[PDB]
């Protein structure tokens, strides 16, 4: 039932910017977090498993880090096809909790 706060609520940036997202769990989830971006009503695009790892097929502009409970997602270069709602997901103890979300807007 671990509460997973996702900061901030929504953002906006221009094409080619670096942006960071924070997810903080109330308890220790040490490396058990992963990251979604979901285009609205569509099949999504893949970001991060195990809080630091990219999957094959994902472009390398996405990255993730975080050790204890604070986790930082990082887009190096924002692109116009990266507008989505960004989620983070706990792995531990199995009332599996998602973040509230992080929306982006193209400037």
């Amino acid at each position: 039932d671990i509460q997973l706060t996702q900061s901030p609520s929504s953002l906006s940036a221009s094409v080619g910017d670096r942006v960071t997202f924070t997810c903080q769990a109330s308890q220790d989830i040490r490396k058990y977090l992963n990251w979604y971006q979901q285009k609205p009503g569509k099949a999504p695009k893949l970001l991060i498993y195990d809080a630091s790892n990219l999957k094959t097929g994902v472009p390398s502009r996405f990255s993730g880090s975080g050790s204890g409970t604070d986790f930082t997602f990082t887009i190096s270069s924002l692109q116009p096809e990266d507008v989505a709602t960004y989620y983070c997901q706990q792995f531990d103890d199995l009332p599996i909790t998602f973040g509230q979300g992080t929306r982006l807007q193209i400037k």
Binding site: D50, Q89, L94
Partner: protein
Amino acid sequence: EVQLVQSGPDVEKPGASVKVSCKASGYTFTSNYIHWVRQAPGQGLEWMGVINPRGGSTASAQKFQGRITMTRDTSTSTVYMELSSLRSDDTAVYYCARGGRALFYDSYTTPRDGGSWWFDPWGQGSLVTVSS
């Protein structure tokens, strides 16, 4: 390819029960836990529960024990989730995706994760609307 495909949108009455299908393709059906995850339109994601397509065992969240039931079909490689005692809060979009290290049953917590923890398979989703 490795893909989960669901049924179409449904419109049900409050107090009834809805059934959503989830058919697999491109992988061994008895090797990946099917997790069901809801999403209200004005809210983020919320994990409903988990079935193993091998042996048909279930588990789910505290907000839905007693209201949700998950069955399987190993022949057609399909997963059925039946949500009973529907209310106006259940108007949402329902998802179903894998997550591996799905060897025996239940959950598999402390062993390995990731690599479509349940990311990949999701497909089109199922809109479920509960009204009159």
